[PDB]
Symmetry: C5
Subunit: 211 residues, 5 copies
């Protein structure tokens, strides 16, 4: 009950050291790479009257800041902590073809590790632009939606995925829709309009009515 009082005291001081003394977001001089991963849980609805499809997925977001690092030794072997997302800067990762505000299904809480890495995994329901024509056929339908920063250019936020394969191991086994394939791919595009690169992660999902 004195180890425990002492360990709490260490956590509160770490959080005050990082949060109260000592983040404006990335700049071209100090750019940030966010690692993104999708875990598709369900294609919930495919609306052929409006060409909207609703997905439920988790989005794992990961980045690393020097100003969040600390030494576990000065803070009682604390190697990580949970904190509300409002306590830290988080990337404005946004779907570029959503048709309604994304609905958050999970607690807005992040895990900060001693080397400055942050991991934040919002579960979400998204309506996005998609013609589901062909979903009732063997070859199925294909849709795509890009994710990336809304306001930071490619000189300030970069992105990558650890694999092209969307994680399907939690995909709902009785969904109305069967997944034929689902890929997530970093894409850098150059436009003449603009000297900065446009970076996004493209999520391509091919699916059909479960038979």
């Amino acid at each position: 009950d004195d180890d425990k009082l002492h360990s709490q005291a260490n956590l509160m001081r770490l959080k005050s050291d990082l949060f109260n003394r000592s983040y404006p977001g990335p700049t071209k001089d100090d750019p940030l790479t966010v690692t993104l991963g999708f875990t598709l849980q369900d294609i919930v609805k495919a609306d052929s009257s409006t060409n909207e499809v609703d997905l439920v997925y988790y989005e794992q977001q990961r980045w690393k800041l020097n100003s969040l690092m600390w030494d576990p030794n000065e803070y009682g072997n604390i190697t990580d902590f949970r904190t509300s997302a409002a306590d830290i800067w988080t990337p404005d990762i946004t779907a570029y073809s959503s048709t309604r505000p994304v609905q958050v299904l999970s607690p807005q809480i992040a895990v900060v590790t001693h080397d400055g890495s942050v991991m934040f995994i919002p579960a979400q329901r998204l309506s996005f632009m998609c013609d589901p024509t062909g979903v009732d056929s063997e070859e199925g339908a294909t849709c795509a939606v890009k994710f990336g920063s809304w306001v930071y250019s490619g000189f300030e936020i970069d992105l990558k995925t650890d694999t092209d394969q969307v994680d399907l191991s939690s995909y709902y086994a009785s969904s109305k829709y069967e997944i034929l394939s689902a890929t997530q791919t970093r894409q850098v595009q150059h436009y003449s309009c603009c000297p900065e690169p446009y970076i996004d992660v493209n999520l391509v999902v091919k699916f059909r009515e479960r038979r």
Copy 2:
């Protein structure tokens, strides 16, 4: 009475302007979870969503919240807003829509440092209701647990294997065949932490 009010504000002030940042590997917390199913409102076989109304009883206990009632005018408990205290981030793992909260976000803290919080909710979750119009009915399942704490920081426990059905609405469109809540612990090659959840399985069918 004007005195008991004085003692309540003082207790609160002592507990809340003196010194709890959430559980850690060094200071883990056991959350006891129990479900009371009130209604299955809707089963949608076009999207495989089912809507439940249920109560989620959450209980945990902290040293930082204990007091001696003798020192505070015999006060043995008090109510406080859930924003005022740490609460566990218990979450359904296969919801299809944000849960809608039906009850006041206020908890009851007891002098032994136990907290009870009972959010009533309507939840849409993933569920194929095929067979609901048959004798055998349909079965669905949804896992609840911490979103961000592993089994190293929050352990979950049930007080019973049975979901409380005694308040189930007797004129629901659906009748309950069985409703159980089973703690489960799981490990993955990738990761060293245990993951703990409570699996809510409900078998149900169209009322006769």
Copy 3:
């Protein structure tokens, strides 16, 4: 006189809820305005009503004589404690239709009357018959036991003087009744006001 009002509000504000030794009695009453919807596919009924709430606090007494003949004021419900009155068989969050503003009287009584839309559990079978349908929903505190909060009605007649004359549904009767319940599981009384409405398709 505006002078006088700010000074009273000044004096009074500068109440953390009831306790077992300082309990609170809340008076409830309902003004049924409309049965807007009765969905027989889900057994949900939607009602629009005013939830009349009143309680009295020692804290809020004053002399209309020490303050320019000011017998009452209005204040945002957000500046004051209000009881956590909740339906016990809603299916959706309640939607509030009116400003959240309370009226405090010099006798220390607070009146707060939100108009609200509520979906609750109700089988409307029989609504297209002469006998019509009958549904019930109970209201009461969610987090205060009957040791800290008690309830009462001023009358058992639901106020129907504002019932919408052209609703799809006519009201055959509507009663509001304080209930006290005891259960073996639990050592506090369960107190609530039960609203029972009998109604049928208008003809």
Copy 4:
């Protein structure tokens, strides 16, 4: 310019009107501009309107003299910055949805103009809408918590402004009026004042 304005506001907002009282009652003028009858639902007896509600009142505690403030005669301010009346429809079926910025104009004479655009669902039986006669519905507007002892209401005209009514609405407008009324109930000594919005309308042809 901005120094004068930032001073004005600091002065007015730092030297708060606690609402009207019986001793100092307030008159609020209301008028409606009806834009559209968006939907009429005959299964639930709910009609939806989109309108602008012009509210206007006048406080002594919001007067200033322009020459002490660089010839400023008016300013725009967030409506959460000032008291605004709790004007409410008495028979809505869904929370009212606000379609415009919650910003008011204060003028040097202490008068305030606030004009929220709103969408409103309200209790209305649309029977007869598919006929030449049309349907008729009414909704009353007034203060939720102030009786006629603290808030009096008025209109400048009892004709609803239809000059902006949408030309290709599903529903044509036959007439629309806004009438101040004073009610006295046996229960209560206070007068209750409202503006009654009555609309007749039919399916456009």
Copy 5:
């Protein structure tokens, strides 16, 4: 450098805009990028449009010398933290739904660029959308509270950007125009400015 930015932000905000006035009017630039007509409801005559508005204005109190601040030329700030123009649709039938983060980019010249993505329901008779010639609807945008003496609204370009319009929408766009309109009304000596967006569209 992370510190140069953390100081620039201090100087501008927590060390000093009550919006525009008749003596200090603001020019605001508006342009539309249309992304999807999602739905046209002929039972209620509403159409739902997903689109972006590019807003741009320049303020003196947002000027700074780059070489006094680490060669920082621009930054990103939350739109809640700066004044932003009250640009509103004059005939929407439901509150706007915001699809993107509400973050503006401020440049050293004091210019501000803000690009909200939104879904907007507005009044629109879709009669004709199932025929070769389509249906035509219009929606005007402008300040709700500031006349043309306080906010002077202009288009950035004369053209609606259709380059990112979703190719597999239920509805094809046959044309879309954006045009600044000035009107004098008899209540008031001030000019009133809006930008009218006119869209002709039909079922794909």
